[PDB]
Each structure stands twice: as structure tokens, then as C-alpha cells.
Amino acid sequence: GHMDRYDFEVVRCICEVQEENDFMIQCEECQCWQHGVCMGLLEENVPEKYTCYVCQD
């Protein structure tokens, strides 16, 4: 499995695309990156601990 059980910079959006939009954010739990506008976050709202759907759902 691609994880190697390690935390890496991994673009995993609900979009199931590794594509980069104008804006992306990183999950504090598993390090994965997402388009914030898909996750309900913007560069204005970036929290200290954003949890991703793969972690929080």
C-alpha cells in the first residue's frame, strides 16, 4: 500500500484528484492536501487544526 504507514505531503481531495487548484490546505492528522474550497476553507479561514474527510468525514 502507497502509505508505507508514513505521513507524507499527499494531495487527497474528495475530488479523488491530485490536481492543484488556486488554493490548497494540509490535514493536521495525516498530512494530506486538498482544495480548501472543496473542504469549506479559504486562505481567510485556515485553522491551526483542519481535519480532512479521510480523518474526520
Binding site: 490546505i25 494540509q26 480548501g36 486562505e43
Partner: peptide
Amino acid sequence: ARTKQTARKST
């Protein structure tokens, strides 16, 4: 939560 932005190529 780490963050990044882009718009065009690096030229």
C-alpha cells in the same frame, strides 16, 4: 494546517 497558492508557471 499547512497552506499554498498558485496561478501560473514559474517564469
